[PDB]
Structure 1
Amino acid sequence: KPKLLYCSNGGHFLRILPDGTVDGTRDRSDQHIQLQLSAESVGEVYIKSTETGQYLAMDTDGLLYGSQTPNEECLFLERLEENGYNTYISKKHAEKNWFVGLKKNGSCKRGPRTHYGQKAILFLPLPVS
């Protein structure tokens, strides 16, 4: 049911740390990379941490974070791209085209700094098992 969100940019797996922070990691054994995606409406998804129960979210600053409670900031519009990768846009900031993204160093690429045509936004869901 859960998957790993592999960031093509730097090859990191999306990670939601116990401290509420979100970043990228190359460590396949990391306990914080197993995410369960759940669709609310069609094309709409929640990305929860199986380890902590936290929901992936995007703040008004465009920074990703681990949310203890699902919420409006927790919704993402998933998009299956032509090149084979998926994309996730902040539903709450769609109009601005704010994506989920990771820098080559595995750090979060703020929503505002994101842009289509970027690698940082390309993700690949992979089986955990």
Structure 2
Amino acid sequence: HHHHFNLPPGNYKKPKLLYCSNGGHFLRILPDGTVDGTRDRSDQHIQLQLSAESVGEVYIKSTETGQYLAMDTDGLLYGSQTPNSNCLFLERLEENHYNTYISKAHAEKNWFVGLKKNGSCKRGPRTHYGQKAILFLPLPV
């Protein structure tokens, strides 16, 4: 493609929690389709199942509700009931350590999945390489 191909180690067999180093929040997909982050590890909407379409391309689904993480045309994250092209993310390693997710549908603009220090999701255009907001650490459930 038009991006590097350094991939993170690990597999997709088990669901995971995506911990964002920015404010220490776990990515969360609420039932109402809202996406944000919470520090509460017992939350039932932070358990995410990642699966790969093609190598380096993944879907991120909440095991609790079955919703797929998706980014709209204006760069906002939301939970989609069905796995369409806007639910695909390029899963890449960053700084030889973290996981980052670029919206495939908007990869030319580098719109990343990201969380602010206050736990609210960042809007695509507002994300950039170099921010802690886009840096995630996957933890097995």
State TM-score, norm by structure 2. 0.90
Aligned residues: 128
Aligned residues: percent identity? 97
- C-alpha separation in 2, matches of 1:83 and 1:119: 14
Shift of residue 50, structure 1, vs aligned partner: 0.1
Shift of residue 82, structure 1, vs aligned partner: 2.5
RMSD: 0.6
Give the gaps of 5 or more residues in structure 2: 1-13
Shift of residue 83, structure 1, vs aligned partner: 4.1
Shift of residue 81, structure 1, vs aligned partner: 1.6
Shift of residue 3, structure 1, vs aligned partner: 0.3
- The C-alpha deviation readout for 1:37-88, integer Å capped at 9, x for no partner, is 0000000000001000000000011110000000011000000122410100
The answer to whether structure 1 residue 86 and structure 2 residue 99 are counterparts is: yes
Q: Which residue of 2 aligns with 1:61?
A: 74
- The C-alpha deviation readout for 1:11-51, integer Å capped at 9, x for no partner, is 00000000001000000000000000000000000000100
State TM-score, norm by structure 1. 0.98
Give the gaps of 5 or more residues in structure 1: none
- C-alpha separation in 2, matches of 1:18 and 1:26: 18
